[PDB]
Amino acid sequence: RALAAITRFGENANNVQNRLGLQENALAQAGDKMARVTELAVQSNNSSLSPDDRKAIASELTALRDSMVSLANSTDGTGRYLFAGTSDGNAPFIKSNGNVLYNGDQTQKQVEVAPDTFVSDTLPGSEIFMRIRTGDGSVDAHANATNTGTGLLLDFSRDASSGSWNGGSYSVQFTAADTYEVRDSTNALVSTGTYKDGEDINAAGVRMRISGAPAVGDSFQIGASGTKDVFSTIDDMVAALNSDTQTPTQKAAMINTLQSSMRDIAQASSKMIDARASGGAQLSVIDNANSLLVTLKTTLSSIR
Template sequence: MNNRISSNMMYDQSVALMLSKQSKLSHLEQQLATGKKIVTAKDDPVASGTAVGMDRVLAELEQLGKNANTVQNRLGLQENVLAQAGEMLTRVSDLTVQANNPALSVEDRKTVASELKSIKDSLLALANTTDGTGRYLFGGAADASAPFSLSNGVVSYSGDQTQRQVEVAPGTFVKDALPGSEIFMRIRTGDGTVDGRAAGTNTGQAVLTDVSRDASGGWDGSSYTLRFTAADTYEVVDANNAVVGTGTYTSGEDVVFEGLRLRIDGAPAVGDEFTVGTAGARDVFGTIDQLVQTLQMDTSTPAARAAQQNALQASIRDVRQASNTMIDTRAAGGAQLIAIDNAASLREANTVTLKSSLSQMRDLNYAEAIGQYQLEGAALQAAQTIFSQMQSMSLFNMIR
């Protein structure tokens, strides 16, 4: 059976073929102009979808990098502030030791007190440091306004206790600057665990120079009072006033009881007491205020002088603990900065891998595309030639 081939059908097929070749050439021209293998999603739907997902991951990595830069800036500022605060507290400690010199006159102590007040003001300014974007460094999450304020000589904290955690790499979080309440306000007294104080009613000249836990252990956190029953003997009572120990006192030697160790110098009076127990908490500004008040104490009698020395020794311990808090915070911030550096390496490695995969999916092989372009151009020319020849074919030409 013979199939009839009409002129219209041949014409339509030729036109469709030329249009197809032209469309292919146009697509190849777009690929060559853009350098991309995938011009539209229909070129490779699977690869196109995968590439979009990778683009999203790259955008997330870029945002994580911005997060890391922000928190790195804040942690760097925290390091600078704490370094300055540490230097100020070192000066406070030096002034405290200087003030403990019996040779100092009343005017000398006033000068020391004046410098201490100036240091307090400088510490307050540091505590209200901003991060350069208008946010306060030590305000926690409530960092839109100054976290520390001074009212009637007393510093208060109005920030919150939140320490942000910022994602700086996939699954990697670092901690932002510590809230100011943990740096400047909630500082443990004494050695950070145990603290001791002389009773305000003492009439002797004994001074508590050190208090700590004994290396042998055994302290259960209870409070005790060491009471002198004579110039060279003492008893230790618990919170219920029950006697738990007695001993002989020698000036400058340690007194050890119930896992605690006290060192007392000087001559006590009968009935003088020293309490020891769990360390409390005080803000660094209050410590400086208390030190200023101590320097203003009356020292006209030996007992009053001993009371001042006891207060100064307590201040030395408290300032030392505040300095340790600054050091510990700086160390914690340094660990976070190291984590940021490690996160940057991870982000960079992931970015290189993703961009390499995207290049394989999207980037054009120019040699292959140019060859294909030339091949399609030759095919289009052939189709156009055939179409032109087909148009000239006619039986009327044969009749003539």
Template structure:
């Protein structure tokens, strides 16, 4: 069998070799120019697909960073507002102590009431603070309208009880600002567990000095009414108005029953009452308003003076609870800000890892690429030289 290589076949083979070398050389030129291993997805479909997935992860980290910036901004503003409110609470307590002094005149108390009214208005303004983008800090999820508004009889809360949870790193969430209902409205009264108050219609001079749970324990959370009787006597009634105890008392001496204790000074009138039981809730605006009303109420009799003192002391207790609530709110916000900082470190570490991996998948090894480029250039020049010499080969040259 004879094998024969035709002239056209030699031309085709030479041309195919040069074109292949030129294609490879062109690809290497593009790689060197762009600094990328893969010019198109077909160069490495699996690697390019994996790189796209890492790009998405990086974009997600950027989105988490934007989320973190937004919630960090809002929490920082919440901290500033609560700090100002804390200063107002301190001033309210100072004014309450000052107003409780017997040496003040009615004009002095009216001046204190005027300052308290200005502080209350400032509290409302602070409670309606925004984040600078038109969203209210303390409105919960309904933060497109002012959360607090004046209505007949007090202040109404227009927001909801939702506290947003924002993802600021993969699997890491932080709570947005607190809803105003938790910061300003649902504040425990009394000592936070038990509350006691002299009845508004009392005519005697009895002053509630202190109250608490008994050290012996035994309180089941029930409410009681104490009715004072003649001869320093008293009767205790439960919530169903059933008499469950009684006895005699002495000023500033503890009265104990049902796991509770209290102390009264002055002289309650026959039929005067005192309620004691689980602490309820009151908004801070109503507490300040109660102080204002007590200071502006006319004082004619000794009973009126005692009622004012009882009202002021009750308000001072509630102001103390409100101040504690503001401190708790600041602490909660501070904890969330710490989480934001921790998440920033996590995002940064993840971003470095992703970028390093992407660099290994995409970035060109210039030393290797330039070496291969020189080899391909040499191979192309060799193929061109061979082709040129091949063109001179002919049987007619041998016959000459």
């Protein structure tokens, strides 16, 4: 009846080991797909491309989003889902009204591979594909959707220039061609200043940089980064590339949208890379287990 326990520990160890190896490969391939998304997006800014060419790129991006879903729905060949957390009974990523939703859970199983010896199972898919910070990872900013001018959001960050950031959201709004106001989340007046094309705008511990010609009333929001799933980000690029771009206004809006999506993809690339690297020591410990060494624990290590 000790055979029963050894078998159970053995099978547990083999299962987690297989899953962890499949996770590592899946994160590598997600890396590659993200790198391909990044290249397609850079190319889509190219001013020589036609609307039709932009559409073909959008079509490739759609295919990449679809293959990222299949990857997110990888199985471990006992037929259990890799990225569902502990609810590894049904497909964790589902298409629903154009969004990809996560049906798995938030728990990374602690697999007991020997008495009081635990190995961390695969990450919940929420931690890989869904909970990806936006912007630069702590602040996010966008050109407002209703903007009528040609103001391009070039970059942004926390910045010690204007002092210290309180985590709050702000709005940079043009009141003349060469004048703007910054307002806080209650619409109170924080600062005003003179607009210079490509010069930093510093208020309340954050900075953004704008080029082109914002129209009167055009605004730019900035605030703490939230999270956005990888599928939505690819999706937004696809919808941006399908946009009409006949006027300077429409071109700026698409560029602003592409460029924001690209910042988010960079965050998505980093997550995959950072996630993969966070798992390597657990795989190395298992692989090198014999090099690193009579109880249940030692009898198990002597077989594997």
